């Protein structure tokens, strides 16, 4: 197919193929349903590259093309801000295949738990992801912009340089823009209202934030569900249940929930509504998170109180009051 | 497995034979299978009738199309005139266990299923007469301006009867279309019925359905697809042959003219690098209009005259007129001398 150049619609990768006079082609470094990512070498502009091979079919192509006006829009403001999110250098057509070129980039956030052997990195390297990461949220939210990524979780945030900080957005194929879907998040990071099946914003990327930070303090994930109704069941767990003024516009309600004679919710194994704690789970008057950090500087009980408040306003039921990315740059954790 | 083991690893509904949704469907049997996912046969209790329904693969490149494909047919069923029923007709759609579903009529066998119980060698002039009808009829529709639909891939797979015995058709995949004046996307239509405006990378409108529909009626016919290029030169080569070098003033402004041709020392365009000249494979020759059809297999029937083939010629090479500006319309086709 494509004249020997196709297998499932994806190009056959030659480790070592040269295209035009300008890319020498390392390996395959990722498979996915739109296609591969393979490692290259660019002569041009003597640099190490990532080269996003879009399947020879139309719908693939044609979520691809929304991608570049999505990446190209960014790319056109002027912000410094835009460096949270990893970089499109150009894009081309060849041998039948859509082509995007990026920038290479380290380890994602999953490979760094996986070498804390999920027991978590400290609080002061979480301030650090949390800060970025709202900041690109801020980015996202401009309003020529207004982007929500979808899927946000550790495996979709990479880190610059392995020895360092730096963190980067990657992934925007699941992206939409407000006003253009209802299975969309990731369990463990989708947020209450899309589980509920009611209309979404750019809030649900906070919900996200705070199911993440979480767990790359703690090394395990916050709400770990097999299905909705065990994820549902898992978030009331810690949070109770939800504002009734919510459950009664929810199409989703009557799967999770149940209405008694006075009107009030209630659900339909788990610990009682509300009695998980995170105040628990973030052991702040205990050492912390299996009383791993007792004694560590930046680690006080002062610290993690802190840490616990804007956690539970990014974890709040209500998109609509849940704490957006400028005024949770401006928290007192932060200072 | 996902969605409470309702979702294989490839994001797709496990269909179980004999399941009642919601008190009203059961399902019967898988009678269709894609990219997009899968189309059941099914029981509606409530109407008492059968249904085809389509689950969308839990993947957003498909469910993007299947969103267009609900708008577009939804806008369709407001309109009152009788000519709607030459698309196939969307009865509802919902959302059962994290899917979309897309509910419409049962049909029958697809146009290229037709063809492959010809052996691939053709259907009578009276037949692809009643197809032709009724197809530019389902054209007009379409360019009705409140509606302003492109189907952008009109095929025989694409066409459908209603019963097997019976002549009647309907339109059938509406989520790879698009409206006028919503058009995003450059490369749009399936290569051997795919437009020399597309081709060309220019500008394109409701004409590019045409085409197709004259590709379509000389391959119901010859029971062979007219231009079978496999890729985009060898298609554009293939066109070239039966029609000849594109006019200068169309190729003067079309991005991806050098891409097929180039010109030569006195300025005039020619290809660029096995095929035959420009203009050689003649359509006259192609249907046979002097040597007793297709291969000569319509020798003697009825219908099939010297002059019954000379109407056909001149309806087709109406259709595949280069320049969509003077390529003919739904409504002036319909009064063509074929179809008297």
């Given at each position: 197919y494509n004249d020997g150049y196709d297998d499932n619609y994806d190009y056959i990768v030659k480790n070592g193929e040269k295209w035009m006079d300008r890319y020498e082609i390392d390996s395959l470094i990722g498979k996915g349903s739109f296609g591969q990512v393979v490692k290259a070498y660019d002569r041009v502009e003597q640099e190490w590259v990532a080269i996003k091979i879009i399947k020879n079919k139309k719908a693939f192509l044609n979520q691809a093309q929304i991608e570049v006006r999505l990446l190209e829009l960014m790319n056109?403001?002027?912000?410094?801000?835009?460096?949270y999110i990893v970089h499109l250098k150009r894009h081309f057509m060849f041998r039948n295949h859509l082509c995007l070129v990026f920038e290479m980039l380290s380890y994602n956030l999953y490979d760094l738990l996986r070498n804390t052997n999920f027991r978590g990195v400290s609080l002061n390297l979480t301030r650090k992801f949390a800060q970025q990461m709202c900041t690109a949220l801020l980015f996202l939210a401009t309003p020529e912009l207004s982007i929500i990524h979808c899927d946000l979780k550790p495996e979709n945030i990479l880190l610059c340089?392995?020895?360092?900080?730096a963190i980067k957005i990657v992934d925007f194929g699941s992206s939409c823009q407000l006003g253009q879907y209802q299975y969309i998040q990731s369990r463990f990071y989708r947020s209450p209202e899309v589980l509920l099946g009611m209309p979404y914003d750019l809030a649900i990327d906070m919900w996200s934030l705070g199911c993440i930070l979480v767990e790359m303090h703690?090394?395990?994930?916050?709400f770990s569900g097999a299905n909705e109704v065990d994820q549902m069941n898992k978030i009331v767990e810690v949070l109770?249940?939800?504002p009734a003024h919510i459950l009664d516009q929810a199409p989703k309600a009557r799967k999770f929930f149940e209405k008694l004679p006075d009107g009030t919710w209630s659900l339909k194994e788990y610990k009682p509504?509300?009695?998980?704690?995170l105040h628990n789970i973030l052991g702040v008057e205990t050492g912390g998170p299996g009383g791993?950090?007792?004694?560590?500087?930046?680690?006080?009980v002062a610290d993690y109180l802190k840490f616990k408040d804007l956690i539970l306003r990014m974890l709040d039921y209500d998109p609509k009051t849940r704490i957006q990315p400028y005024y949770a740059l401006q928290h007192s954790f932060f200072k």
């Open positions: 056109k403001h002027d912000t410094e801000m835009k460096y340089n392995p020895k360092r900080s703690t090394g395990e994930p916050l109770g249940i939800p509504p509300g009695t998980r704690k791993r950090r007792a004694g560590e500087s930046g680690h006080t």
